[model samples]
Target: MIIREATVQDYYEVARLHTQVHEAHVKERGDIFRSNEPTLNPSRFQAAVQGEKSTVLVFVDEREKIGAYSVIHLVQTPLLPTMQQRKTVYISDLCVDETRRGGGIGRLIFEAIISYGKAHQVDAIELDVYDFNERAKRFYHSLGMRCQKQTMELPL
Candidate 1:
């Protein structure tokens, strides 16, 4: 498998993986994740790739086509008024191709991101996983991640 940063050349692969995850989220979260587009536009990810302090990564198969992808932000860690300044990498999105789920592509993409975080001297790697996604919770937990906050909502 090949792991590398995403470029404009990788438009379709990135968008396809994102939509694969989105459909699953909609299934798990019901109307909370409504379908806005019949097919998600690739530009959503293209803009992220072109943004400053942000990066999109991909894991490609033996044929060099992307099988999984992740988006990350390099930024300052949040702190209280009296807290010390800190740095960290935040993962915004990670999704494997629908056909490739459970085949270890996600793990490969994550390991590459870990190496990236360490090289940047970040204090931690952080991400948000929706409460409805049990499989994702377990996957992240298996990576030794802990929850720092709980998001509560009461839909009227």
Candidate 2:
């Protein structure tokens, strides 16, 4: 397996993987527009790829098939009166091909992102997993990640 930064050429496969993951999310939860909107649209993904604020990474096997992908966005936080300046790399989307699960592709992609973050001097790396995704939570925990925040929503 080979891990590398995703180029524009990888968009189609990455977009497909993103859609699959989004559909799975909808099935596991319900009508969550915040997550579904971006995943369903290729233009939104294209914009991010062209924008300077984010990056996409992909893990490809020997056959040059994308086995996993991840999107990371750079966020800059200004220094406040008492706080120090910092920058964070927020991992927005991460997905591995369902048929290829347990093949270590996910971890390889994740580690590539981590290496990128360190080289770029990002202060921290973070990602949000849905509350119902127990399997994902366990996987992330095994990677030594801790929950730092929660996102809640209420219908009008």
Candidate 3:
């Protein structure tokens, strides 16, 4: 397994991965419609990837095909208390090929995120997991990450 920052020309596979994950998000959230989903185009990276130096990292298999990906950004992060620093790698999005779960691709992508954070001297790696995503919750916990907050909603 290999992980690398994707270039504009290398975004086709990553875009495909995003489509798979975000459509799952829409159905999982229940308030979203299938047609209402926005296009998951690679050019969506036009601003963040170029300006703030946000990263799109891909996990490549031995065949040089992308199996999963993560989009992360270093943003101002604070959790209502003191920490070593304010900047952190916020995992904006993550997706694995539905056919490729249970393998180590997700783990590798996360490890790459950690290496990127440490190399850049960022303070932490963070991401928001939906309450319905029990598999992802367990995966993150196995990595030693703890939830700092929760979101609740009441039906009308």
Candidate 4:
């Protein structure tokens, strides 16, 4: 398989891959997510495909089928005076086809994202996974990501 920056033509398969994660979110956190929504719409995908500070990366096999994808955004923080300035590459979403998991495609995509972040001089690469997603959290740990902060909520 090959990893490459995504183009407009790749939206369909990427959208298909997005469905699994989206549904999982709804299943695990229905308080925050709704069901029956299209995870990645064409217009949003188009914008990312052509966005100046956003990137979409895809993993494609020799048969030209996309098995995994990631969306990342370049962010600049510390608009306020107290915090230190930082450039971060935020991983907005990542998903691998259900049939394609455990084959290291996710790690390959992450390596590519790390290279991209370094090339762009980002101080860090960050992503958020739900507390219920233990497997994904384990994968992130294996990739050297640690939880720098946590958000806790109290229900009324």
Candidate 5:
């Protein structure tokens, strides 16, 4: 598989993967995730690809098919009175084509994401996974990641 930064031309292919993610989220937490709206639309995907401090990556197979994708932000937090300066490469989204999961494509894409952070010299790489997504959590755990924080909620 070939991993590279995504371009606008990759919008449609990437969006298909986004739908898989969105649909699953909707099924798992419909109260928070909408089914009517697309997770990654053309306009949004284009903006991410062209954003100054953001990057969109894609994993392509030998057949030139996009198997997985991820979006990341290079965030620089300025020093504050009580906070230390820090830089983080935050992974905003990541998904492997549903048809391509369990084939190690997700791992390859994650490894590529780490390389992106190293190339940019960020302090850390971060991402969020819904509590219901045990499989994803397992994948991340296998990659040696630990939970640093959590967002708690009480349903209204």
Candidate 6:
């Protein structure tokens, strides 16, 4: 298995992967919709590749088929009175192919994202998981991610 930064040529596969993961999550929990549309446009993807502010990393096997992927968004926050550092990274999405589950590929992809964040001097890393996603919650906890706050929303 090989893990690498994705290029524009990998956009189609990334979109497919995103859709698959979204559908799976929706099946597991009913509130979210995993749209089939390509969320990351080509220009944005290219800019990410060029600026290193964001990335879509893919895990591929010998046949060059993507088995898992993660998208991370890097940002620089304004220096606040209580905060000394301004850089942080947000993990927007991480998904493993349903057919290829339980192979540690997802963990590998996440580790790569963490490594990239560390290398870039990001002050922190953050992501959100559905409250009922026990499996994902446990996985993230195993990776040393802790919950700092909870958010609740009401429909108008």
**Which rank order by TM-score, best down to worst?**
5, 4, 1, 2, 3, 6
Q: RMSD in angstroms, candidate 4?
A: 1.3
Per-residue alpha-carbon lDDT of candidate 1 for residues 23-119, written as tens digits (9 for 90 to 100):
8888888667876564456666678889998999988788978888899998885777998788989999998887778888878888888999999
In terms of lDDT, the poorest run of 10 residues in model 6 is 31-40
lDDT for each residue of candidate 3 in 1-156, tens digit (9 for 90 to 100): 688877776666777777777777677875752533334654675554565658888888999899988888878756655654388889988888889999988888998899889998987788998888898899999999999888888978
Worst ten-residue run, lDDT, model 5? 35-44
User: What lDDT tens digits, residue by residue, belong to model 6 across residues 30-105?
Assistant: 6655444665466765676566567778999989898887878888878689976578789878878878878888
* Model 1 spans with C-alpha error above 4 angstroms: 77-80
Which lDDT values do the candidates have, in the order given? 0.84, 0.82, 0.79, 0.91, 0.90, 0.80
Task: Pick the lDDT winner.
Answer: 4
lDDT of 2 at 56: 77
Residue 142 alpha-carbon offset, candidate 5, angstroms: 0.8
Off by over 4 Å in 4: 78-80
Candidate 6 overall lDDT versus native: 0.80
Error of 2 at 33 (Å): 4.7
Off by over 4 Å in 3: 33-38, 77-85
Task: Write candidate 4's Cα lDDT for 1-156 as tens digits.
Answer: 799999998978999899998888899999998876577789999999899999999999989999999999999977677888889999999898988889999999999999999999889999988899997999999999999899888999
**TM-score against native, each model:** 0.89, 0.87, 0.84, 0.95, 0.95, 0.81
Extract clashing residue pairs from model 2: none
Give Cα distance to truth, residue 101, candidate 6, Å: 1.6
Itemize residue pairs with steric clashes in candidate 5. Answer: none
- Candidate 2 lDDT trough over 10 residues, lowest sum: 32-41
- Between prediction 1 and prediction 5, the one with superior lDDT is 5
Worst 10 residues of 1 by lDDT: 35-44
